[PDB]
Structures are given as structure tokens and as C-alpha cells.
């Protein structure tokens, strides 16, 4: 049995109740921003690569009102979130910028306020609710950053592009959460359309909408319900390793390298740098091919490319873990499954599986029964991006 995904009207109702209770009046404003699953194109976004994510119906909802006093007052019901559930801080000023602190969850909101490009931004009271499982690799943090950005636009309209908004949320993640992410998770939370995955070119920031609206195809998300500590620590190590191979080959990024130059340059780089760069160069090519394949309705070829994405992440990039590998092999053993692999950063989180709609009940019975741990499952249709909810 797959996990009932609370609809937007439900998260919003919980967010109003906690707000009405907390601040003594109805919130004036509200927004939603989703999480995301990457179908293929892992560890390519900070390498100016290609990724193929879709937005989920798992989302973050902000409700709030402007204040007159220049303070920010937050409450989150998110029961994963670190204590306290409440936090207040002053707006940043010419005299004093905000700094990351405790609790961790509020760093995502502080960062987006700090880099919000439009002025004058008023103080606000807000409640944050989320159905995105925290640390589960479905971009909880990007959903919060983008929900915050969308809210701030209701207080104080911005004048730039949708990429610029993604880059603000990215800057918040870099400076306030110490996590040097690529643009994928912010971009998909912002640009997602119902019935479509997004081919994102992280060099040009061109995006292509790729239909998934075929009723006999299902995308299954399996949460391992594990997050090894490597998760936080090893991400910035892989990024600097890639940047060092590009610099050693005289390339602005690995986007500009192909496997043949890399083969030929292999004595300019560590054995390990070589293997990371070979994952990225291949995964860029796989994502381009997967996108054409999906557009063609060729799921088996999409499925092959997903499994080769997994192997490359497990062996060359080394960002899988026993739990993800076990979930992937288990899913591949099931008839009707085109392919399976880890999605997001790795070291835990979720696999994504493409399978026959009709094969999905058997798939969950098998994977759960064939998992050492306790899996969770989401049956996911491609959702819209961030939007305003008119209260």
C-alpha cells in the first residue's frame, strides 16, 4: 500500500489552524512549492549537465501575513524539524545581515530573505507545513526555499526571471545551509508542469517539457528510510573533485568534456577524479538519450539508461549504499519494471522506478518483502511547480 499524499487544501487547512492558534488571526497570504524526483541525470547539475526531474504532489505550504515591526516570526508543524518549532529574528538591514544558526530548518528561510532581490520587504508572521519527507532525497529544503521565495513575492514583487529566483534559493542553500547544490531542485520546484518532466540544461538554463501523461506508465518512489552521515559530508567532496578534473583538462566544466578527451587526459588527474568525471560525462549523454527515449514512448530504452545511471553512481561516483542497491535489484527482479535507480544526492533517500501502471501493486509487495529495512512508497504523477493560493 502506497502512502496517501495529502492534497494542497489539506496542508493549507492544517497551516491556517496552527497559524490562527499561534498569531490570533487568519493568515492573509499563502503559497505552495513541491519536492521533486530526478528520473535520471544525477550529479550533473553542478557540472553544467542535463537533468530530467518532475515535481511531486508532496509539497511545502506557507501561510502568513505582513507585519509592521520589521520582525520575522515562524512556526513549523514539520515533526522531523529540529527544536524549537518556532523562531523569530529581525529582517536583515544595511547595518547587519542574518547568519545561519539553530534551529537548522529556519536557515533555509533566513537565506532566501537575505538574498531576496526586491525591496522594501516587510516583516511577516508565517507557518510552514510540508508532506516532503525530511532528509529523504526528495528536495524538502528546495521546497521550503521556493515556498519562501513565492511568499516574499506576495509581500514585495520581484522584477527578474524564473532562473534568477532558482539562483536566489540556491544561494540561500550555499550560504545558510553550507550545501553547495546545483540548480536542479530549485528549478523543478519553480518550473514543474502537471503531466510533464523537465529536461533542464544546467549550462543554458533552457528547459524542455516532456509528457508522461500515459495511463499505463507509473513512476514508483521507494524511500529506504535511511540517511547515512556520509550524505551531508561527501556531496561537497564530489563537487570539488569534478571541478578539479575540469580545471586540469582546461574545461570551464565537465559538460565541455567527452569520454574520449577524458580517456586521453587520464594521467593529468587522480584515478578517483577520472572515475567521478567518467560518471558525469556518461550521465550527461544518458540523460539526453533518456529524454529522446521518453519523448518516443520507448520505456524499455529509458529503463536501460536508468539502470546504467544506477551502476555508474554506485561504482564510479560511489554515492549509493547497500540499502539503495538492495531496493534497485529487488525492483528489477519484478516483471513490468522498465528500470530502477537511486535519485537525489545518495547515501540514503529514495529509488525511482518506471514500470507498467498494472505492475505497481506486485512491485511494492516484492520490494518491501525483499528489503532488509522498512520501505515507504509513493505513486507519483508529474505535478505543477510553485504557485500562489488565494485565501
Ligand X SMILES: OC[C@H]1O[C@H](O)[C@H](O)[C@@H](O)[C@H]1O
Ligand Y SMILES: O=C1CCCC2=C1[C@H](c1[nH]ncc1Cl)N=C(Nc1nc3ccccc3o1)N2
Q: Which residues are catalytic?
A: 185
- The radius of gyration computed from the CA coordinates of the chain, to the nearest angstrom, equals 21
Q: H/E/C letters for each residue in 6-24?
A: CCHHHHHHHHHHHHHHHHC
185 annotated ligand binder? yes
Sign of CA dihedral 205, 188, 177, 243: negative
345 near ligand X, rule: CB under 6 A: yes
211 near a copy of itself, rule: CB under 8 A: yes
140 annotated ligand binder? yes
308 near ligand X, rule: CB under 6 A: no
**Least spacing, CB of residue 367 vs Na ion, in Å:** 8
135 annotated ligand binder? yes
Q: Quick one: which of 117, 311, 371, 384 contacts Na ion (CB under 5 A)?
A: 371
* Complete edge-to-edge strand list for the sheet that includes strand 217-227: 337-342, 348-356, 217-227, 376-380
193 near a copy of itself, rule: CB under 8 A: yes
Cis peptide before 103 (omega within 30 of 0): yes
Alpha-carbon distance 87 to 72, whole Å? 8
388 near a copy of itself, rule: CB under 8 A: yes
269: closest CA among 240, 227, 290?
A: 240
Compute CA distances 171 → 115, 181, 182, 261, whole Å. Answer: 7, 9, 10, 32
Q: Which does 233 bind (CB under 5 to 8 A by kind): a copy of itself, Na ion, ligand X, none?
A: none
**Least spacing, CB of residue 54 vs ligand Y, in Å:** 19
Q: What angle do CA 258, 186, 196 make, to 5 degrees?
A: 80
Part of the chain binding Na ion (CB under 5 A), chosen from 156-164, 221-229, 350-358, 368-376 = 368-376
**Least spacing, CB of residue 199 vs a copy of itself, in Å:** 8
Alpha-carbon distance 167 to 173, whole Å? 10
210 near a copy of itself, rule: CB under 8 A: yes
**Least spacing, CB of residue 44 vs ligand Y, in Å:** 20
Query: Crossing angle for the helix pair 271-296 and 230-248, nearest 10 degrees?
Result: 100
**Least spacing, CB of residue 201 vs ligand Y, in Å:** 26
Q: Which does 204 bind (CB under 5 to 8 A by kind): a copy of itself, ligand X, Na ion, none?
A: a copy of itself
Alpha helices in 62-183 (DSSP H): 107-115, 140-155, 162-176
101 near a copy of itself, rule: CB under 8 A: no
Q: Which does 185 bind (CB under 5 to 8 A by kind): ligand Y, ligand X, Na ion, none?
A: ligand X
- Would you tell me which residues interact with a copy of itself (CB under 8 A)? 29, 154, 160-163, 191, 193-196, 204-211, 213, 295, 387-388, 390-391
- Would you tell me which residues interact with ligand X (CB under 6 A)? 38, 42-43, 45-46, 139, 181-182, 184-185, 344-345
Binding residues for alpha-D-galactose: 36, 42-43, 45, 185, 235
Amino acid at each position: 500500500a502506497a502512502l496517501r499524499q495529502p492534497q494542497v487544501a489539506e496542508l493549507l487547512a492544517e497551516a491556517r489552524r496552527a497559524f490562527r492558534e499561534e498569531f490570533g488571526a487568519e493568515p492573509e497570504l499563502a503559497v505552495s512549492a513541491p519536492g521533486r524526483v530526478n528520473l535520471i541525470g544525477e550529479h550533473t547539475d553542478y557540472n553544467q549537465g542535463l537533468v530530467l526531474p518532475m515535481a511531486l504532489e508532496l509539497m511545502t505550504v506557507l501561510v502568513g501575513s505582513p507585519r509592521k515591526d520589521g520582525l520575522v516570526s515562524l512556526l513549523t508543524t514539520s515533526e522531523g524539524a529540529d527544536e524549537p518549532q518556532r523562531l523569530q529574528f529581525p529582517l536583515p538591514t544595511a547595518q547587519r545581515s542574518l547568519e545561519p544558526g539553530t534551529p537548522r530548518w529556519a536557515n533555509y528561510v533566513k537565506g532566501v530573505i537575505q538574498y531576496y532581490p526586491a525591496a522594501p520587504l516587510p516583516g511577516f508572521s508565517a507557518v510552514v507545513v510540508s508532506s516532503v519527507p525530511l532528509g529523504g532525497g526528495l528536495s524538502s529544503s528546495a521546497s521550503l526555499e521556493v515556498a519562501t521565495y513565492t511568499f516574499l513575492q506576495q509581500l514585495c514583487p520581484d522584477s527578474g526571471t524564473i532562473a534568477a529566483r532558482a539562483q536566489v534559493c540556491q544561494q540561500a542553500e550555499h550560504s545558510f545551509a553550507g550545501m553547495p547544490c546545483g540548480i536542479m531542485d530549485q528549478f523543478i520546484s519553480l518550473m514543474g508542469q502537471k503531466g510533464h518532466a523537465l529536461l533542464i540544461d544546467c549550462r543554458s538554463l533552457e528547459t524542455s517539457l516532456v509528457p508522461l501523461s500515459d495511463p499505463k506508465l507509473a513512476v514508483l518512489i521507494t524511500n529506504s528510510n535511511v540517511r547515512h552521515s556520509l550524505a551531508s559530508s561527501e556531496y561537497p567532496v564530489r563537487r570539488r573533485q569534478c571541478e578539479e578534473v575540469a580545471r586540469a583538462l582546461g574545461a570551464a566544466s565537465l559538460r565541455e568534456v567527452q569520454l574520449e578527451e577524458l580517456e586521453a587526459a587520464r594521467d593529468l588527474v587522480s584515478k578517483e577524479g577520472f572515475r567521478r568525471a567518467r560518471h558525469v560525462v556518461g550521465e550527461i549523454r544518458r540523460t539526453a538519450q533518456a529524454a529522446a527515449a521518453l519523448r518516443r514512448g520507448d520505456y524499455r530504452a529509458f529503463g536501460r539508461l536508468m539502470v546504467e545511471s544506477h551502476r555508474s553512481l554506485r561504482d564510479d561516483y560511489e554515492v549509493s549504499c547497500p540499502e539503495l542497491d538492495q531496493l534497485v535489484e529487488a525492483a528489477l527482479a519484478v516483471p513490468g519494471v522498465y528500470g530502477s535507480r537511486m535519485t537525489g544526492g545518495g547515501f540514503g533517500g529514495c529509488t525511482v522506478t518506471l514500470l507498467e501502471a498494472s505492475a505497481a501493486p506486485h512491485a511494492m509487495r516484492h520490494i518491501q518483502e525483499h528489503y532488509g529495512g522498512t520501505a515507504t512508497f509513493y505513486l507519483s504523477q508529474a505535478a505543477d511547480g510553485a504557485k500562489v493560493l488565494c485565501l
